[PDB]
């Protein structure tokens, strides 16, 4: 649930690079946020074999 509120004809939101980052539920007219699920790299520290 977001602290954004927009005009009643708008359905979803976009940002500076045109990524969808907010959406309206078509039954309860609430504004949800969208964040990505967690990703990253895996790095292995070795002292040498």
């Amino acid at each position: 649930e977001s602290n954004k509120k927009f005009l009643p004809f708008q359905q979803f939101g976009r940002d500076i690079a045109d990524t969808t980052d907010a959406v309206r539920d078509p039954q309860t007219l609430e504004i949800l946020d969208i964040t990505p699920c967690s990703f990253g790299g895996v790095s292995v520290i070795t002292p040498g074999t």
């Binding site: 690079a17 990524t19 980052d21 990505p36 990703f39 990253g40 790299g41």
Partner: protein
């Protein structure tokens, strides 16, 4: 930009580590002249 696989990695020296390096170069010049960059700091 985190949506599409882009990340930013942090630097190895922080900003307080770089400020500690520049204040040690300043104190060596004000108290020793050019001697601390050639050996031991000799006050003058």
């Amino acid at each position: 930009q985190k949506f599409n696989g882009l990340t930013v990695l942090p630097p190895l020296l922080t900003d307080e580590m770089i400020a500690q390096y520049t204040s040690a170069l300043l104190a060596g010049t004000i108290t020793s002249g050019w001697t601390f960059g050639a050996g031991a700091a000799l006050q003058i």
